[PDB]
Amino acid sequence: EMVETVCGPVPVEQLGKTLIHEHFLFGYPGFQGDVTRGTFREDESLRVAVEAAEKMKRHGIQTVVDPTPNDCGRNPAFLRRVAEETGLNIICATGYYYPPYFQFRRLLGTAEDDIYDMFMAELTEGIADTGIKAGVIKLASSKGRITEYEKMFFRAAARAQKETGAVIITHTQEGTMGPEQAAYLLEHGADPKKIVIGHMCGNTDPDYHRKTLAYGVYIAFDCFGIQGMVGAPTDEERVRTLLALLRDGYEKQIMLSHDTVNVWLGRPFTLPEPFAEMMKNWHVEHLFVNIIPALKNEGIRDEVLEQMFIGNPAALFS
């Protein structure tokens, strides 16, 4: 029926065309310390975020899930301003990126309960004093492992999902741990119909995808546009992989996005001369002007695309 957005409860029927994974603001944990040279320019960031929203609206997007973690500059009030100005639905997350603070609490033996309590509060009561509730729990694991630290969050997320029916979205690191994340979550009673394993496009082996899909979870090809960096494949490989799975009939378990960061938090930077060119399609319009027209050429029917962009998000949050 209803999902919490940065503008309060919204009927899932009205979510419409959805991008399952984009960031209006993002900073790598640690940016906080670089406040002097990497100060947050609120009004310019708002202008940029609002233009990103208008770009997405031009291609029919009505809803964005922004899964920025608590420690990566999540700013629900900022997100509400963007939404209030543009009419875009924005759903935010509760969760942490893939350290000493929650490690200290392990010593006291309250860490997993504290995390669960954080999740419950932010899902059912509100984030700080913003009055905004998260619509998803965000989880992440490391390359090649889900560490003991990370598993605490997975267990807490599974507990919170069982009490709230909240959606879980994950981050996989460099094409690893897709099946493991699914299996561990289900072990702990999470519902596969409410789980999205993310960054599945980071792996070019279709059998890796099918092992993950076999759990009945959603997977996301949510890094379209990212090429060269963080071990990334290329967009062609992503499309090849995606094209193999839809032909196998997996369209009811697959969503697409770019994982853009429209405003970087912390100090500005510049990607070097070869990298920057390769990364030039990393923007919120890329799926619509390049990828989807290519899926058209290979013969993907519009009813399938609508399943991924409309039906799947609608079923997920239902």
Q: Does 234 bind a copy of itself (CB under 8 A)?
A: no
CB of 296 to a copy of itself, least distance (A): 36
Judged by phi (left if over 0) then psi (alpha if -120 to 50, else beta), residue 120 lies in alpha
Q: How far is CA 41 from CA 10, 78, 162, 174, 263, in A?
A: 30, 12, 39, 31, 10
Per-residue string for binding with a copy of itself, 106-135, x by CB under 8 A? --x-x---x--xx--xx--xxxxx------
Element (H, E) at 140: strand 136-140
- Residue whose CB is less far from ligand [O-], 65 or 295: 65
- Alpha-carbon torsion angle 189, 191, 196, 200, nearest 10: 60
235 binds Fe ion (CB under 5 A): no
Q: Write the binding mask 157 to 196 for ligand [O-]: x where contact by CB under 6 A, - elsewhere.
A: --------------x-------------------------
Q: Give me the DSSP letters along 197-239.
A: E--GGG---HHHHHHHHTTT-EEEE--TT--SSTT---HHHHH
**DSSP H or E run through 8:** strand 8-11
Report the nearest approach of Fe ion to the CB of residue 165 (Å). 23
Does 102 sit near a copy of itself (CB under 8 A)? yes
Contact between 259 and Fe ion per CB under 5 A: yes
Shortest distance, position 92 Cβ to a copy of itself, whole Å: 13
- Distance separating alpha carbons of residues 137 and 235, to the nearest angstrom: 28
Residues 238-277: x where in contact with a copy of itself by CB under 8 A, - otherwise, as a string: ----------------------------xx-xxxx-----
Binding residues: 21, 23, 138, 171, 199, 259
